[PDB]
Amino acid sequence: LVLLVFERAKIIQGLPRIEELLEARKPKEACILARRPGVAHINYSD
């Protein structure tokens, strides 16, 4: 009939994480700031 959308609130790590860390691979997350400054405007645009 329909397909409801919702947000759930939800971690353990094992061998894949260790192998990824020791082989120095590229994960997909964690945008990293590049220069010092002192203000972080979130800027919720239209």
């Binding site: 061998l15 260790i18 192998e19 020791l22």
Partner: protein, 49 residues
């Protein structure tokens, strides 16, 4: 088991030549050891580390 065995073999071959040959390099550098804590709670005390 296969994943664990492959990882151990790679670890052994990367670091086989580390043997102790010297007594002292005469430096003044090191790191800072502190307890491992999850915010309010501590997980590993400093004395064990």
């Amino acid at each position: 088991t296969a994943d664990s065995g492959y990882l151990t073999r790679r670890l052994v071959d990367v670091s086989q030549d580390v043997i102790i040959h010297e007594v002292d390099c005469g430096t003044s550098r090191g790191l800072f050891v502190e307890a491992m804590t999850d915010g309010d709670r501590i997980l590993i005390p400093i004395s064990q580390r």
